[PDB]
Amino acid sequence: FEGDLKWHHHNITYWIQNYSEDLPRAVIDDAFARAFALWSAVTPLTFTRVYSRDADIVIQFGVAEHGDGYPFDGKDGLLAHAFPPGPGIQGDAHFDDDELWSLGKGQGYSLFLVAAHEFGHALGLDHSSVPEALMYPMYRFTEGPPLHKDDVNGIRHLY
Ligand SMILES: CNC(=O)[C@@H](NC(=O)[C@H](CC(C)C)CN(O)C=O)C(C)(C)C
Ligand SMILES: [Ca+2]
Ligand SMILES: [Ca+2]
Ligand SMILES: [Ca+2]
Ligand SMILES: [Ca+2]
Ligand SMILES: [Ca+2]
Ligand SMILES: [Zn+2]
Ligand SMILES: [Zn+2]
Numbered sequence: 001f002e003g004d005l006k007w008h009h010h011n012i013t014y015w016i017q018n019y020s021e022d023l024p025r026a027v028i029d030d031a032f033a034r035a036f037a038l039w040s041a042v043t044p045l046t047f048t049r050v051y052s053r054d055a056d057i058v059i060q061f062g063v064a065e066h067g068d069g070y071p072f073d074g075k076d077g078l079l080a081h082a083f084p085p086g087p088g089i090q091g092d093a094h095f096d097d098d099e100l101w102s103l104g105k106g107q108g109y110s111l112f113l114v115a116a117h118e119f120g121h122a123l124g125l126d127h128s129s130v131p132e133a134l135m136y137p138m139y140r141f142t143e144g145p146p147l148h149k150d151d152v153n154g155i156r157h158l159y
Contacts, residue, residue: 001070003084006124006158007056007091013048015055022101023111031103032059035115039123042152043159057122058089061097072096079114079139082121093118109139116146125154 016032019025036047065071068089072078075098082093095101095114102108113134120135128135133148 001081001083001121002126003086003090003124005085005090007045007085010045010159011048012045012057012123013050013055014057014059015050015052017058017060020061020095020097020101020111022097022108023103027103028111031112032115035112035119038116038147039119039155042147043155045123045159056091057119058092059095060092061095063096063098066094068094072098074098079109080118082118084121085124091122093122105141105143110141113141113146114139120151120155123155124158125151128154 014032014036016029019028023031033049040046060066063072064074070081072094073096078096079099080093080095083090085091093115095111095118100108101111103110103112117134125135127137128148128150130136130148130150131140133150134146135151135154
């Protein structure tokens with residue numbers, strides 16, 4: 001799930017294929033939209049929601065075996081995974097629906113913060129070594145602006 005390719009276009013599209021059962025669809029749509037806004041705010045990239053398989057970034061929730069060759073591991077552990085820029089499954093983001101999805105403080109994992117991380121990968125970013133960076137390989141809930149200077153540098157270096 002590591003590559004050295006970026007998107008050659010800036011008007012990126014995404015399709016929310018299916019939903020998690022833990023949150024209302026209006027809440028999920030908004031969380032994803034706000035996750036994309038974080039990135040489009042520090043780059044010339046834009047994100048448009050479409051409803052066909054033609055989108056660049058296809059989003060889906062799955063449990064265990066779900067299509068590709070990297071099944072999820074049930075409760076906890078791996079929360080999700082995304083693929084680097086490119087055609088087909090490339091650039092897609094998958095979330096493990098065996099996890100309890102929520103938002104803000106409290107039990108469960110923030111769909112908003114995890115989405116922002118996955119979309120980072122979907123745009124070409126690799127993991128960061130800075131603990132407070134959003135791209136750090138470990139989940140950590142936080143309030144306030146999610147993107148660290150390190151995350152902003154990495155994304156602007158590509159676009
Ligand atoms: C609570 N569990 C964890 O913190 C696990 N980490 C993850 O599931 C990463 C995503 C979080 C950072 C949103 C996977 N990743 O890199 C996706 O692109 C483990 C550190 C246990 C692997
Ligand atoms: Ca902008
Ligand atoms: Ca794709
Ligand atoms: Ca899991
Ligand atoms: Ca769930
Ligand atoms: Ca919560
Ligand atoms: Zn997958
Ligand atoms: Zn990651």
